[PDB]
Amino acid sequence: PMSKLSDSKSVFSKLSNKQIETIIQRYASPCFIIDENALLERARLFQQAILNQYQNSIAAYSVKTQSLNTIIQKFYEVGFIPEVVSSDEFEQIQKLQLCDKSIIFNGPYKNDASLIKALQLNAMINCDHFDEILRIAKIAKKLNITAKIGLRIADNKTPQNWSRFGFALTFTTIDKIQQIANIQLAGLHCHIGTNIRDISRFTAMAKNIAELAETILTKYKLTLEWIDLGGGLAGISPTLSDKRLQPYNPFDLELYAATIIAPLKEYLNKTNDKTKLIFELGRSLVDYSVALLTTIVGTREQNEDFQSLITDAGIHTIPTISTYRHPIYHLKTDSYHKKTLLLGPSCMQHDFLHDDIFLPKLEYGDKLLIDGVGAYNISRNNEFIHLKPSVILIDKNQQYQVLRVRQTH
Amino acid sequence: SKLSDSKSVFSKLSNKQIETIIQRYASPCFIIDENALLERARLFQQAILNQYQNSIAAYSVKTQSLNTIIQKFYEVGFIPEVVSSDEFEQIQKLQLCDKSIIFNGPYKNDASLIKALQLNAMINCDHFDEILRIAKIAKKLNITAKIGLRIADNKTPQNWSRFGFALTDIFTTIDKIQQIANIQLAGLHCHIGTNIRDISRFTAMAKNIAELAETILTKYKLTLEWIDLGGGLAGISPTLSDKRLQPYNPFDLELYAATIIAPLKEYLNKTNDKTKLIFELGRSLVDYSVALLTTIVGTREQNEDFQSLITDAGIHTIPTISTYRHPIYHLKTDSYHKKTLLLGPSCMQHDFLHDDIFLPKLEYGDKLLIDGVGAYNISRNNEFIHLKPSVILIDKNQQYQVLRVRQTH
Ligand SMILES: *Cc1c(COP(=O)(O)O)cnc(C)c1O
Ligand SMILES: *Cc1c(COP(=O)(O)O)cnc(C)c1O
């Protein structure tokens, strides 16, 4: 019964048919829309959650999840430190000419130029393979300075967190590091997956990371400068295999912060709260503040009990629709719903938004709102068949601000 | 295994040439061999023309949408074939002397239709309500629109499809079209799938289309103006579900042409060869003339029975790698191979170029060439994590031409 946008729990339930028509008139269909108020409320509440649990906590902005410059700026304005996983992302942040050049540099591939600038700005660099530690050392001699680094750890003692990415925690690697000159171990990094709703996995990882920081404490007389627990917390959209049809409530960030931090408080207290605790939540912060407006542009079948419709948005506009049941809302005053097949604007057999959803009868020109698409869609748009659609911010004054102009030939 | 001993059109490519390409345009880097590409194009036109004089090769824009490549095929005699309003507009911006164009696809917006109806384009509709939108536009212009009907060859088991009018009461659809003012049936369009290696599916479709064209001629005394047989012929790369690991030879176009045309010559001669016969092959024409140069940038494991390496290109640079076993060649000199895992420059579980290929031991700075990437990769590049790489044309003269500049922030 919450099929209708105005009757939903969506951030965008406030949007009338008239407002949607105006957005599309100005910026064309399909159109991404981002609500600034909801987005920055979530950002600030996350900072409160972690700081209430540990006062030397730092929220880092996961650029890859939502890489629009304007959004990065706004999270930076409330105290987030940019976190990048590539040299391009690293240089994106530099071009923003931010006053505070603090930055977290992750990723399996950091080119030489990126690592030079990073060292000059004393970024926090977390390495996940050995050859990179060596390349940083040679740079750390040419550049007459010692380089602090962190090590990405794989929580391979936890079955659900096992990963080939990072040094496995199942030590020989740290013995080598300290005989290495110009390199000084300064932190740990661990990122165990994505869309994690079983926060037992965060407890497990935090316990093993704490045991590691304790063993590093004794076998090496070293207190870590930072512990980065990555991201991975679940968003609001159920997976397609999930039996739940309705979206989840945005995950309780106080529950997340208390669960993951609890196994680490013992170590952090010995360090007199000088070890920084870093969090890199992306999806769970940004997903539900972004929706896609799409228009029905054709009909293949239309009978009492079934309709097959063509939309102007498909899997090349929101690729994560192939993995998640993103909520789909309509604008009709109509009680009778029928099985509905929503096809994208491609005659490719995998380009559909949903094959088993119940919606009222729709026709050419009707609009749908696809909610919870704020993570890992916009920046994956491409120029295949259809050019990239507009991205609009509903700013904190309820005024539209274009963040990406619709592409044209 | 090694590039020099390969059957690849880049077999001829030197380490110094490759290192020059990368030094000049960075890694990863797409390369397109002009000679191989246009030779394939001419052979296809020659194949279909020797079977039927009024055969027209159409260029599948979506398969390889770089403007320069489009212009080349246009100069060889190909007519542009588009499947979206954006592609349509891309072609008009080329300002070709001959405005002939094929307009396919499930979504054609009003602006493109108004333009296409007044440029004598062959417009193939796949759902009825598009027909009615054309009819109403045509009435505003006081013209009668000639349209083609996309047909689903649902009598052939492998060709069953939702896209197009079902050929299995199809005549109930053309009966309705006969009554609609400002519309006249003029052509048929059939596109039965992709990466089709069983040409029995083409011969079956051509026979069914021939029968439909005969019935139309007898029921409505109507001789069709064109028959569009679509594309879909297979490329050189096996699927990952394929048991075979080595690339196939480029499919025999003479065989394809002779077999798909033969069921239609009774009709086409009955028409004194005035029906135009259009072909829209893409993958099979362009895939093997394009390769991706990638560089090893790190190591995770290195035994003599197994190695796990990090490349600077992944599924976001060549997304068809998740579906196809694209040939991967090295430039070294060594007999000894080992199970090799090639990890993309992302720490996502699914970002790997190949997880059980045997390759010589490779190290940081070593280079690989992934062949057969010319279909459905370049235009799907995006700005997620890594910006888009350069695309380089290897001229007729073996000189380098920049078709897409490396992207930077
Ligand atoms: C993906 C990722 C994140 C964010 O992950 P989410 O699921 O969106 O929360 C943070 N840090 C790193 C290193 C990552 O790879
Ligand atoms: C995809 C497509 C083509 C090209 O298909 P290929 O497999 O690359 O040969 C031609 N015409 C239409 C309508 C298409 O959708």
TrEMBL record, chain B:
Domain Orn/DAP/Arg decarboxylase 2 C-terminal: 288-374
Catalytic residue positions: C347
CDD domains noted in UniProt: PLPDE_III_MccE_like
The Orn/DAP/Arg decarboxylase 2 N-terminal domain, residue ranges: 47-286
Cofactor: pyridoxal 5'-phosphate
Modified residues (N6-(pyridoxal phosphate)lysine): K62
Binding positions (pyridoxal 5'-phosphate): H191, T194, G232, G282, R283, Y376
Gene that this sequence comes from: figC
Top-level taxonomic group: Bacteria
Molecular-function annotations in GO: diaminopimelate decarboxylase activity
Organism of derivation: Francisella novicida
InterPro entries (UniProt xref): Ala_racemase/Decarboxylase_C (IPR009006), De-COase2_C (IPR022643), De-COase2_N (IPR022644), Orn/DAP/Arg_de-COase (IPR000183), PLP-binding_barrel (IPR029066)
Keywords for this protein: Pyridoxal phosphate
Gene3D superfamilies attached to this UniProt entry: Alanine racemase, Lyase, Ornithine Decarboxylase, Chain A, domain 1
GO biological process entries: lysine biosynthetic process via diaminopimelate
Family of the protein in this entry: Belongs to the Orn/Lys/Arg decarboxylase class-II family.
Matching NCBIfam families: FslC
Listed name of the protein: FigC
SUPFAM superfamilies associated with the record: Alanine racemase C-terminal domain-like, PLP-binding barrel
